[PDB]
Amino acid sequence: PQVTLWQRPLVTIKIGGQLKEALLDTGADDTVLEEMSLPGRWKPKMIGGIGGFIKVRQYDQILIEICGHKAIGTVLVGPTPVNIIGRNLLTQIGATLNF
Amino acid sequence: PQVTLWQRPLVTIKIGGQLKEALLDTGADDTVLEEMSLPGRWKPKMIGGIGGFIKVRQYDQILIEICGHKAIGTVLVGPTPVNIIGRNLLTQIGATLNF
Numbered sequence: 600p601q602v603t604l605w606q607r608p609l610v611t612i613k614i615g616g617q618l619k620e621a622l623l624d625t626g627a628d629d630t631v632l633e634e635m636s637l638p639g640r641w642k643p644k645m646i647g648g649i650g651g652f653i654k655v656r657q658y659d660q661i662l663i664e665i666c667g668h669k670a671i672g673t674v675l676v677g678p679t680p681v682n683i684i685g686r687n688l689l690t691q692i693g694a695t696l697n698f
Numbered sequence: 699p700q701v702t703l704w705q706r707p708l709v710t711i712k713i714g715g716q717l718k719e720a721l722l723d724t725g726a727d728d729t730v731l732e733e734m735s736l737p738g739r740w741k742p743k744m745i746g747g748i749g750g751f752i753k754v755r756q757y758d759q760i761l762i763e764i765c766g767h768k769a770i771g772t773v774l775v776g777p778t779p780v781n782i783i784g785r786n787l788l789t790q791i792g793a794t795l796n797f
């Protein structure tokens with residue numbers, strides 16, 4: 600669908616039997632989910648953000664269902680304020696920005 | 699234009715008489731630009747992301763051109779590594795995000 604940006608673009612995701620809401624984020628290279636039980640199998644990783652690095656864990660090959668859209672990639676879970684879908688997954692959903 | 703998200707969506711702004719590139723970022727509600735020479739007065743403000751919070755200076759009523767499209771709005775300037783165009787300008791140049 601077409602999201603305007605008057606309001607944060609949120610979407611519902613399903614992920615490991617859990618239902619969440621997450622920001623569709625084009626500046627984020629990586630999807631970051633706040634803490635969750637994902638079964639695995641993860642390595643650690645640190646990403647940077649605005650003013651600081653966080654230690655996050657990398658799960659790979661995780662089915663996410665974002666709107667009616669199944670996709671699979673890496674998600675990182677970690678102590679984020681807000682769950683964020685970045686461009687590793689936005690490219691699978693076929694997201695576009697238009698201006 | 700339409701940009702797909704296979705790489706970072708970066709566009710040139712002209713601001714303050716200066717040319718820069720900035721990220722177009724749907725997930726940011728404010729624009730945050732690395733440290734630069736902008737005139738005016740400004741107020742202290744603190745903003746948070748991943749990692750935590752930065753204090754930026756806030757300037758208001760600033761002319762940005764982002765591709766060939768002018769915008770006036772609040773620009774926060776401060777320590778960030780990436781200059782971000784966030785929803786407040788993005789709304790004005792009419793970006794939409796579609797999938």
Ligand SMILES: Nc1cccc(CN2C(=O)N(Cc3cccc(N)c3)[C@H](Cc3ccccc3)[C@H](O)[C@@H](O)[C@H]2Cc2ccccc2)c1
Nearest residue numbers: 626627628629648649680723725726727728746747748782
């Ligand atoms: N790799 C990666 C994955 C996930 C998140 C980030 C880090 N980000 C942020 O810190 N943000 C704070 C940010 C950035 C700009 C403006 C504001 N208002 C906030 C928000 C995400 C966010 C966090 C918390 C609350 C709301 C949103 C922004 O929407 C994201 O695009 C990037 C912007 C960015 C900063 C530094 C380096 C690269 C990219 C990076």
